[PDB]
A = this chain, B = another copy of it.
Amino acid sequence: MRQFKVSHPGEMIARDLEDMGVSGRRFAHNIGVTPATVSRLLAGKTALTPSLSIRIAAALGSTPEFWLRLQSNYDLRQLENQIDTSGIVLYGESN
């Protein structure tokens, strides 16, 4: 329904970790990645990749697909009005 703010999933995770009292360092060791990587993820500087989504789901719940879908909606938001599609024809007959 056109949500006004679409947050990067890393920033959502960071907020949850604050709410759960879990540090970056503890999160890193649990999910098996370097604190550098966790920092960049949580800051929204880098994407939640498929392989991260597997790890994250195992620690934080829901499915990897869910985590990737958040990242996709986010990627799409940032790309809004950056690609001119006005000249692309919609193949097929009009309903």
By a beta-carbon cutoff of 8 Å, the part of chain A in contact with chain B is 16, 20, 22, 30-32, 50-51, 53-55, 58-61, 64-65, 68-69, 72-73, 75-76, 79, 82-85, 87-92
A84 to chain B: which residues have CB within 8 Å?
A: 32
Closest partner residue, chain B, to A73 (CB atom):
B65
Q: Out of B31, B59, B64, B88, which one reaches A31, CB within 8 Å? A: B88
Query: How many copies of this chain does one complex carry?
Result: 2
Q: Say how far A38's CB is from chain B's closest CB, in angstroms.
A: 13
A68 to chain B: which residues have CB within 8 Å?
A: 72, 75-76
Whether A79 pairs with B65 at a CB distance below 8 angstroms is no
Whether B91 pairs with A54 at a CB distance below 8 angstroms is no
Q: Say how far A23's CB is from chain B's closest CB, in angstroms.
A: 11
**If the complex has contacts A64-B76, A65-B76, A72-B65, are A89 and B51 also in contact, measured as CB distance less than 8 A?**
no
A31 to chain B: which residues have CB within 8 Å?
A: 88
